[PDB]
Amino acid sequence: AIRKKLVIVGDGACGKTCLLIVFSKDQFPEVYVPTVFENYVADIEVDGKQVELALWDTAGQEDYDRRRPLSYPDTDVILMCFSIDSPDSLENIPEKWTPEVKHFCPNVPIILVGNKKDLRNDEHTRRELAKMKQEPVKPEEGRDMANRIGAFGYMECSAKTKDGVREVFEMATRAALQ
């Protein structure tokens, strides 16, 4: 199999760890891990090729001991995430995550991922965002942001329902093979 390294980044609580666990284990977790600390390697076949895809989760800003610069070397593809219930997490894509990823991984393909797609139609989410004069992120906003940052693709998924989860990793694997 071809060896590729995937790193997942994005705002705290936008669903990165759960996306890795639901893809790797096919089960939404019941306990809390900030950062997957076991070794996840996925076997993925795309367009006839066997790929071993190492899944690197990341730490937020306060976990200095596992700071992201330690994890960026030799990355083959980036999953850059925001949550559909958080327009703030989307605004951090161009302001925070793209400058950081381009600093450490300037030539690596990016898949822009909108997580928690199940909350787009959730009334708690709708009413909480509406009290801020906000609304859940629309697909066209994700697509526009993909163009802005030069992402290889824009994908939406829900770790909670599994909708779109395998497809995110198949797209990331096809980008890593280029």
Ligand SMILES: Nc1nc2c(ncn2[C@@H]2O[C@H](COP(=O)(O)OP(=O)(O)O)[C@@H](O)[C@H]2O)c(=O)[nH]1
């Ligand atoms: N509704 C919903 N909640 C999710 C989803 N994925 C994760 N969460 C929840 O969002 C919170 C943060 O998830 P986590 O994966 O730890 O986020 P991280 O900080 O980006 O790693 C937790 O309470 C999860 O249970 C999803 O697809 N849908």
Ligand SMILES: [Mg+2]
């Ligand atoms: Mg996490």
